[PDB]
Amino acid sequence: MMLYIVFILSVIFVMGFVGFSSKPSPIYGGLGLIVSGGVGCGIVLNFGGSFLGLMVFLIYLGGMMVVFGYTTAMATEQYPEIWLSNKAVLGAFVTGLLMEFFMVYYVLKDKEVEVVFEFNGLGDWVIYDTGDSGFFSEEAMGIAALYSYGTWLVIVTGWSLLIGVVVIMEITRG
Amino acid sequence: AILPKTISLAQMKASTLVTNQKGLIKLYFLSFLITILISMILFNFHE
Amino acid sequence: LQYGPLAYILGEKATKKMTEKSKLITVDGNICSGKSKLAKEIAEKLGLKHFPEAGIHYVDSTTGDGKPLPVQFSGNCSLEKFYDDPKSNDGNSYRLQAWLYASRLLQYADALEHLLSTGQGVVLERSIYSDFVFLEAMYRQGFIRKQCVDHYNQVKKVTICEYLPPHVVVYVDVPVPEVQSRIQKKGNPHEMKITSAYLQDIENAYKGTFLPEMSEKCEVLQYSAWEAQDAEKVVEDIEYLKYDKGPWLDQNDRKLHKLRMLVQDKLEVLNYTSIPVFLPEVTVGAHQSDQVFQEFTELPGRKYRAGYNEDVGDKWIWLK
Amino acid sequence: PFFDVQKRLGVDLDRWMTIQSAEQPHKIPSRCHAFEKEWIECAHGIGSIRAEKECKIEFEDFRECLLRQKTMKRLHAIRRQREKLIKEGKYTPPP
Amino acid sequence: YPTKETAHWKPPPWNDVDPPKDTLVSNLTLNFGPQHPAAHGVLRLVMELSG
Amino acid sequence: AKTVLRQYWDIPEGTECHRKTYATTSIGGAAGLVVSAYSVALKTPTSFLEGVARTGRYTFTAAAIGAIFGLTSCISAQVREKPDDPLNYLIGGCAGGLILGARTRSYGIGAAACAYMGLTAALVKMGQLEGWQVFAEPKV
Amino acid sequence: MSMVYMNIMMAFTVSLVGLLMYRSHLMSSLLCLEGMMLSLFVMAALTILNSHFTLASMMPIILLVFAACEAALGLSLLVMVSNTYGTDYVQNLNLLQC
Amino acid sequence: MNLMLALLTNFTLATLLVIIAFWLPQLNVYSEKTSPYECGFDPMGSARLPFSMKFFLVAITFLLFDLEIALLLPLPWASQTANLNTMLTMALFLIILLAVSLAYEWTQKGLEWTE
Amino acid sequence: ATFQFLPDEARSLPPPKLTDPRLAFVGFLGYCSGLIDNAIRRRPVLLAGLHRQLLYITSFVFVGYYLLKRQDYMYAVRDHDMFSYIKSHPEDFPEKDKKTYGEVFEEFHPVR
Amino acid sequence: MNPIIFIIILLTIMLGTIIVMISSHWLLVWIGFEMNMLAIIPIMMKNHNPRATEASTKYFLTQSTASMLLMMAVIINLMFSGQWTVMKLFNPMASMLMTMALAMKLGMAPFHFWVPEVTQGIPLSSGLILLTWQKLAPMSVLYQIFPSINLNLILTLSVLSILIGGWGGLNQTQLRKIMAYSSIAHMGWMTAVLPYNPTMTLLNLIIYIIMTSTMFTMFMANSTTTTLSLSHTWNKTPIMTVLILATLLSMGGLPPLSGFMPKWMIIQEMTKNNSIILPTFMAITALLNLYFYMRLTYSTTLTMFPSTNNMKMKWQFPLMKKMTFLPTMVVLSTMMLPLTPMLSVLE
Numbered sequence A: 001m002m003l004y005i006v007f008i009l010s011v012i013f014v015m016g017f018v019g020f021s022s023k024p025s026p027i028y029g030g031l032g033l034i035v036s037g038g039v040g041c042g043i044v045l046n047f048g049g050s051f052l053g054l055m056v057f058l059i060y061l062g063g064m065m066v067v068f069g070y071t072t073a074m075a076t077e078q079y080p081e082i083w084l085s086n087k088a089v090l091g092a093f094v095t096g097l098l099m100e101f102f103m104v105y106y107v108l109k110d111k112e113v114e115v116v117f118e119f120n121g122l123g124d125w126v127i128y129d130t131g132d133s134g135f136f137s138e139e140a141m142g143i144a145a146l147y148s149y150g151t152w153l154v155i156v157t158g159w160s161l162l163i164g165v166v167v168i169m170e171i172t173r174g
Numbered sequence B: 001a002i003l004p005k006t007i008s009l010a011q012m013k014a015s016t017l018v019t020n021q022k023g024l025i026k027l028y029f030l031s032f033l034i035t036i037l038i039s040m041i042l043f044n045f046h047e
Numbered sequence C: 001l002q003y004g005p006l007a008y009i010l011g012e013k014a015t016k017k018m019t020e021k022s023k024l025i026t027v028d029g030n031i032c033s034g035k036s037k038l039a040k041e042i043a044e045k046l047g048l049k050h051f052p053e054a055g056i057h058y059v060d061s062t063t064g065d066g067k068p069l070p071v072q073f074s075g076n077c078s079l080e081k082f083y084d085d086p087k088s089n090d091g092n093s094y095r096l097q098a099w100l101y102a103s104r105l106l107q108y109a110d111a112l113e114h115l116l117s118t119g120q121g122v123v124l125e126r127s128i129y130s131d132f133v134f135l136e137a138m139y140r141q142g143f144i145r146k147q148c149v150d151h152y153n154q155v156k157k158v159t160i161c162e163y164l165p166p167h168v169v170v171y172v173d174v175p176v177p178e179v180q181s182r183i184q185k186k187g188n189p190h191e192m193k194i195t196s197a198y199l200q201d202i203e204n205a206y207k208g209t210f211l212p213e214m215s216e217k218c219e220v221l222q223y224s225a226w227e228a229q230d231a232e233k234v235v236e237d238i239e240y241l242k243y244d245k246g247p248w249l250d251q252n253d254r255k256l257h258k259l260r261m262l263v264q265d266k267l268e269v270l271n272y273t274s275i276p277v278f279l280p281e282v283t284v285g286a287h288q289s290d291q292v293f294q295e296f297t298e299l300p301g302r303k304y305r306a307g308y309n310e311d312v313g314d315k316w317i318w319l320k
Numbered sequence D: 001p002f003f004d005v006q007k008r009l010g011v012d013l014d015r016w017m018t019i020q021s022a023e024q025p026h027k028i029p030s031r032c033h034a035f036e037k038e039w040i041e042c043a044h045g046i047g048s049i050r051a052e053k054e055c056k057i058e059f060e061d062f063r064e065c066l067l068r069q070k071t072m073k074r075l076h077a078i079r080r081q082r083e084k085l086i087k088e089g090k091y092t093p094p095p
Numbered sequence E: 001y002p003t004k005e006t007a008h009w010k011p012p013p014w015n016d017v018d019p020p021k022d023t024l025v026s027n028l029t030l031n032f033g034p035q036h037p038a039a040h041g042v043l044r045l046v047m048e049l050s051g
Numbered sequence F: 001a002k003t004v005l006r007q008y009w010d011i012p013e014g015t016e017c018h019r020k021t022y023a024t025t026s027i028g029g030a031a032g033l034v035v036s037a038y039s040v041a042l043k044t045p046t047s048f049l050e051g052v053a054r055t056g057r058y059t060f061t062a063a064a065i066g067a068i069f070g071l072t073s074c075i076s077a078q079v080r081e082k083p084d085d086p087l088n089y090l091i092g093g094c095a096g097g098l099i100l101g102a103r104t105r106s107y108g109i110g111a112a113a114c115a116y117m118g119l120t121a122a123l124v125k126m127g128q129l130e131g132w133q134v135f136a137e138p139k140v
Numbered sequence G: 001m002s003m004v005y006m007n008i009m010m011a012f013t014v015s016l017v018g019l020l021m022y023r024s025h026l027m028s029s030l031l032c033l034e035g036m037m038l039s040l041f042v043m044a045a046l047t048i049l050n051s052h053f054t055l056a057s058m059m060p061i062i063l064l065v066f067a068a069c070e071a072a073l074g075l076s077l078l079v080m081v082s083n084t085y086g087t088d089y090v091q092n093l094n095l096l097q098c
Numbered sequence H: 001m002n003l004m005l006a007l008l009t010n011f012t013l014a015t016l017l018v019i020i021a022f023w024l025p026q027l028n029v030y031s032e033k034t035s036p037y038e039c040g041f042d043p044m045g046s047a048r049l050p051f052s053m054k055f056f057l058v059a060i061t062f063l064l065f066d067l068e069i070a071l072l073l074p075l076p077w078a079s080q081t082a083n084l085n086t087m088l089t090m091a092l093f094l095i096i097l098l099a100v101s102l103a104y105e106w107t108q109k110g111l112e113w114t115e
Numbered sequence I: 001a002t003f004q005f006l007p008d009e010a011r012s013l014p015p016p017k018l019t020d021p022r023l024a025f026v027g028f029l030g031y032c033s034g035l036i037d038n039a040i041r042r043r044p045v046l047l048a049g050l051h052r053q054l055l056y057i058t059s060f061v062f063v064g065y066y067l068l069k070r071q072d073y074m075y076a077v078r079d080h081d082m083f084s085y086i087k088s089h090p091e092d093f094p095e096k097d098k099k100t101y102g103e104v105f106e107e108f109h110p111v112r
Numbered sequence J: 001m002n003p004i005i006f007i008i009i010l011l012t013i014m015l016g017t018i019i020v021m022i023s024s025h026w027l028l029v030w031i032g033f034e035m036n037m038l039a040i041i042p043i044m045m046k047n048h049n050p051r052a053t054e055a056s057t058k059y060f061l062t063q064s065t066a067s068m069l070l071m072m073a074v075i076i077n078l079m080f081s082g083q084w085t086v087m088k089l090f091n092p093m094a095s096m097l098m099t100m101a102l103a104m105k106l107g108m109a110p111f112h113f114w115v116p117e118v119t120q121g122i123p124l125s126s127g128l129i130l131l132t133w134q135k136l137a138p139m140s141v142l143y144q145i146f147p148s149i150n151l152n153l154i155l156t157l158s159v160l161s162i163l164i165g166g167w168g169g170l171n172q173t174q175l176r177k178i179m180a181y182s183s184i185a186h187m188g189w190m191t192a193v194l195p196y197n198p199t200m201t202l203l204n205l206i207i208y209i210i211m212t213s214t215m216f217t218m219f220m221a222n223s224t225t226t227t228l229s230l231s232h233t234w235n236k237t238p239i240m241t242v243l244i245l246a247t248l249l250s251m252g253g254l255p256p257l258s259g260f261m262p263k264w265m266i267i268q269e270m271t272k273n274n275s276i277i278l279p280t281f282m283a284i285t286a287l288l289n290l291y292f293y294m295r296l297t298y299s300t301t302l303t304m305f306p307s308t309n310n311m312k313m314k315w316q317f318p319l320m321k322k323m324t325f326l327p328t329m330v331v332l333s334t335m336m337l338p339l340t341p342m343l344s345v346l347e
């Protein structure tokens, strides 16, 4: 069952998505997006990208903290909805869990499944590379190249973040 | 029924169908979901 | 350079020109209350530009050669006819008030433009902010209809919102019985037909709506008949005002640039004074409209844009 | 590109990341480097219409390297067959 | 072309500005004391808060 | 859609009219549902039952036009022994328009529907015989 | 494909359906946009890491950068919608029917 | 496995302490005890009512600035490149632009809380 | 050549005559713009600002000269590509033997 | 808004569009779209009113959704091709998602619902950018991926756009909403010919941009946003009514005006490919566009509607608007048909 770690995490990934896609109160929607960002970190980390997985987890922790503050200010009501409080929320939540459950059940039983498309259920390990013995991290060298190869990328993203500051000040001024 | 009166009436009738909307974000994006579904389920535009 | 974003970028900013003396002053009061005398004397002592009260022919005085045009080019609206038969079938009563508000609207834009571009204050006699008192007086007396007031409020709503109110609202209080008497001494036969109920409605509007409203946003100085006579004592009150309220405290060069862009473009100022609302009193049929517009372009100096009419002496047109 | 200013000005704004056989930091090769090289060199200069037919052999191999779908069917069939024998007592995996 | 569904439609404002609403921008009310370190124990300071 | 249209097109005209009705009723029923889905989504019904009731009407009406066309057209083919005749579809297309008029309870609509649906159906048969392409494949 | 791809694509589809099926809170839907990025980030990262396509290792980072710009712009509009109406309900944003 | 064992142990022990805390003490529950606290008087309105955010603009800016650190974190690795001329320029270019946006928001009064 | 308005090979084509009727038309469009510019701004249409009216004719002619030069080049390229292809594939463009109407049979349709 | 800030943002709207058009990498194309969206929202919110806020929100939600389907298509393409080059996609699902993403960005039916509402809710000058400059980036992508586009999908979007654009405009009195449904109808023509001759997609896009700018610039000139206010123009600037009549007849595609050129050349390329029914259907359905263009001519130029007394005050003031390029654009909108062979420069 440990050879299926990446699949188990991906199951929780979907459960988190169903958690906030059913759209309860954004307080709980934020929590589900945090859980998905946590296992998502673990999924990416298990393919050799510890930096990428840790970054997305860190970035989404900051984003959801601001969303929480905005929720208490602009998206609250007397009785915030949990997943059981509303039929539409519960119905959407139940439907997602059942769809995920039957996908997991059949892919595990057959070691293969067709959910619209063909997916192989042998486990994710089978596709891994077999010949790693370099004395560095390939993810790090690729990311570190943003400052040498990716001059043009640095310019457009750097400009866009500056414009983002300018634009949010225009939008939010009366 | 090549009458101008009938032709102009069908366009009038069709014009009211197209334009008489509620202006609600929720209903528009709901119809997007319907369009995507049938684009695959009914016409196999995805293949 | 004509004023615009480029000129603003290069340094032309309203805060440079403006000072502690860049003020917009308005003198209000009933009819024959002494406004004009007081306003003219305030302007000289403080060294401000004086705009006489905007009449029917104010627009003429700012375009062309400055002389009044024949009345058919202002719609035949007449003040005298209003006093003779204010309940006329031809709707002259509301056509006048609608025209007068547009004239006041244009004068306010000119006044603001003078202040912003040169920094010098201005003195006005009534304004778009007090023009409604005549509307209410007309309605109470049954001179105009409910629809006309609705139309007036539509136009006022989408035009007065763009501007800033005066810094100072000088007001002269002269009770109706004295106003009555001061009218006969004027000797205009048409004015003497004015009823006192009409003048009372004017007073009630000023003291009922105008002054209470303008107190929250401007400095309001009220003077009696004799108080108003010493213009020097009025100027003394103005010179020591605190100026600590109203929207002028919130104005920065970004806002005053946008404001100055509006007031220098007169067709943008007057845009909504002709909204397509078809009241009988202000609607003109196609044939009358077309025929009069042909006459207007036949007036000296009016066929072409100013500076391109060589029937009045313009030169170098082939290089302009 | 709609306007190939990069190839006009001799400037490389983004062609360096377009393919995985491009020059990588410290000469670290992608897993499917050989297949992509072979497919790209086959189809160079003849256009997509010809390449779709004439470079099919190289593209299917490259596709096989990328997604490994035929490899997993070969391994899935063996793993399923082996367990079908385990119960029947017809196979003993080696030590 | 008028219909039953569009009967309630009205032309937009001439200047494209709809009047500001007052849907309730209410303040938060808080009992600051009496039982409170900074209220000296017998001060019920009823305090209307925006943030 | 391709499958149902192929089934209708890939069986000989005028033979086995009970099958053809299955194909044209399926096309009609499907079109009625597509209208129901967009109509229900864009014009929210007041209740669940109204939304289902509206869906039933559109799906029934569209399917009824589909069945009658596929039946009227095929019966005339065997009756007249003219399998490859656009005239058969003109009758089949008109019969559909009459049903639309009855379901909409409007002679004017029923009269207009016949002319447009009858002539549209007749043109479709000509297109099949002549090889007319609606969405033509790029060639030059 | 691998069985992890089944779940990540499922996650993207779930958040897309959550996005297209609005309720009331505009904030709830802005979350679904953030979710859709998260699934796209994970799926892109897996493909790039598994193929060992080194230079592409930086584009998931770039993906996140413009997700924040997109989220920040969305929150800026939500603030302005809330100021006008006092809630973030999307049913209030229907003036432009007429 | 070491890390997952460490995480499982940490949160298990925390959960165990909560379980003891709730099942070991003697409970005495009634309405007045569990009512919300507000210094002795009953609260006025719900605590779920909107709470104005006066730093809303800074919070949005935090999003854009928090992504910058994700772009700047790889810099210790970027310093190993042979192409040191390019990285140093681009590293400094990014930081300067981050400084420019702070200067723009500062000067425009974006850092001051609304009233 | 990629992203070149006029590739180098276009120089071996004869440039458009400055008396090209199409160019004369482009100059006429420039003149019409100048008159419209006077009209919308309520200036004397024919006389006002001849310096401005002149820059209209010149700018239209200047821009229109190079558009015409590239137009001609792109049709020359089309023909060059087409004729070369016909030379590369003789079997797809065979030379039929043309019969005379004395031999070819055509049906007669009387108009009665 | 500060004038320098307005210029910088406006250049960023253009910069994002340029990035899309010069990029060879799908990620940079996606970046160009995000940059363009980030810079156009502040131009919609410029006048700060509840209608601008609504329009900006509806625009952001539609564009943000489309961008997400675009990126999904890109990643699927990377999965099945291991490359990022902007060209034909290598997966039919990727093509469908990218095609729908670009249809949403363009506002093509049935993804069209936002175009009339966003256009109505923003100032005329912002609507001009929306209905013209914002078409360039999505079209430049379609121009490059059309070999893998599903023919049934693209032609269905074309047909629906022409019908819905034609029908939607019949019910409108707001000029900004008439231009929105006109835009939807014209997008259908550009994509209808794209599978057959992409050069004619460019020709139709260019001429549409010229004519659309000409109309918006003349609406801006008199600050008119409704039919009735536009009907007062004859009593202010008679010349402006003749220019509007000529441009509206051209948009309607009447010979011998410029706007007939795209319809003429698109019909030609489709009949070379044995497509007779579709271009015949498209031309007849375009008569819907001509009908609600003709009404604007009747109330503007060919009759004289009632005026108001205050209109006389406007006679004394000259037009002050910049009206940039209006003399040149109006001549290009009407008198280009004799120079049609010049279309080969786009080849």
Ligand SMILES: CCCCCCCCCCCCCCCCCC(=O)OC[C@H](COP(=O)(O)OCCN)OC(=O)CCCCCCCCCCCCCCCCC
Residues within 6 Å of the ligand: I032, I035, I036, I039, I043, I044, I045, I046, I047, J239
């Ligand atoms: C060899 C050239 C043959 C000419 C071919 C003309 C083809 C149409 C060209 C379209 C451009 C026309 C000029 C643009 C309008 C400007 C003129 C105007 O608006 O009013 C007329 C004006 C006189 O009025 P005013 O305002 O007082 O100016 C004082 C100057 N005397 O100015 C004048 O006195 C005369 C200015 C020209 C008047 C143009 C008349 C309208 C032409 C457009 C109608 C359609 C043209 C015919 C269509 C078939 C195309 C051949």
Ligand SMILES: CCCCCCCCCCCCCCCCCC(=O)OC[C@H](COP(=O)(O)OCCN)OC(=O)CCCCCCCCCCCCCCCCC
Residues within 6 Å of the ligand: I039, I040, I042, J237, J238, J239, J241, J242, J243, J245, J246, J249, J256, J257, J301, J302, J330, J331, J334, J335, J336, J337, J338
């Ligand atoms: C060359 C090959 C290509 C051929 C294609 C066809 C070319 C057409 C190009 C059209 C370009 C627009 C140029 C139109 C110029 C018309 C001249 C004009 O506008 O009339 C002058 C007058 C201007 O008024 P104003 O400047 O304010 O001075 C006071 C005078 N009233 O205005 C008025 O006062 C008139 C007010 C009454 C309105 C009457 C409207 C009916 C006349 C319409 C004629 C124009 C029709 C254009 C459509 C195409 C025609 C073929």
Ligand SMILES: CCCCCCCCCCCCO[C@@H]1O[C@H](CO)[C@@H](O[C@H]2O[C@H](CO)[C@@H](O)[C@H](O)[C@H]2O)[C@H](O)[C@H]1O
Residues within 6 Å of the ligand: A117, A118, B036, D069, G009, G013, G016, J076, J091, J092, J093, J094, J097
């Ligand atoms: C709006 C919702 C969007 C949700 C997105 C959902 C995820 C989309 C997954 C895209 C990948 C689907 O993958 C699809 O299945 C298999 C993959 O081997 C392929 O299968 C098909 O093509 C290949 C050709 O080489 C062969 O297997 C075979 O000819 C055929 O079966 C399809 O060509 C491919 O399109």
Ligand SMILES: CCCCCCCCCCCCO[C@@H]1O[C@H](CO)[C@@H](O[C@H]2O[C@H](CO)[C@@H](O)[C@H](O)[C@H]2O)[C@H](O)[C@H]1O
Residues within 6 Å of the ligand: B002, B004, B005, B007, B008
């Ligand atoms: C036969 C093959 C070719 C035929 C082509 C004919 C297409 C139609 C051309 C005319 C279109 C006119 O469009 C519109 O038609 C109707 C009637 O017809 C007119 O409407 C008029 O007739 C109707 C009914 O007769 C009256 O209720 C209405 O009061 C009256 O205004 C509209 O004022 C006109 O604007």
Ligand SMILES: CCCCCCCCCCCCO[C@@H]1O[C@H](CO)[C@@H](O[C@H]2O[C@H](CO)[C@@H](O)[C@H](O)[C@H]2O)[C@H](O)[C@H]1O
Residues within 6 Å of the ligand: B005, B007, B008, B009, B011, B012, J170, J284, J287, J288, J291
């Ligand atoms: C062979 C190809 C034929 C091409 C036809 C070209 C399409 C032309 C489309 C015109 C459609 C709009 O035209 C519209 O027709 C209806 C017909 O009733 C008219 O409507 C008229 O009759 C109805 C009732 O019958 C009245 O309620 C309405 O007050 C009256 O005006 C509209 O006033 C007109 O605007």
Ligand SMILES: Nc1nc2c(ncn2[C@@H]2O[C@H](COP(=O)(O)OP(=O)(O)OP(=O)(O)O)[C@@H](O)[C@H]2O)c(=O)[nH]1
Residues within 6 Å of the ligand: C029, C030, C031, C032, C033, C034, C035, C036, C037, C053, C079, C082, C096, C097, C100, C131, C134, C186, C191
């Ligand atoms: N109906 C109407 N009459 C107006 C308006 N403004 C001025 N008038 C009239 O114009 C005439 C002169 O203006 P007044 O200032 O009020 O009278 P006055 O004699 O000049 O007395 P002074 O205030 O000292 O200038 C008065 O008879 C007014 O009734 C107006 O906005 N509406």
Ligand SMILES: N=C(N)NC(=N)NCCc1ccc(I)c(Cl)c1
Residues within 6 Å of the ligand: F140, I074, I075, I077, I078, J196, J197, J198, J199, J200, J344, J347
């Ligand atoms: N129809 C296409 N898909 N391609 C296209 N636009 N032209 C293809 C043929 C062509 C036509 C004119 C010229 I001038 C040239 Cl050089 C080449």
Ligand SMILES: [Mg+2]
Residues within 6 Å of the ligand: C035, C036, C053, C125
């Ligand atoms: Mg006076």
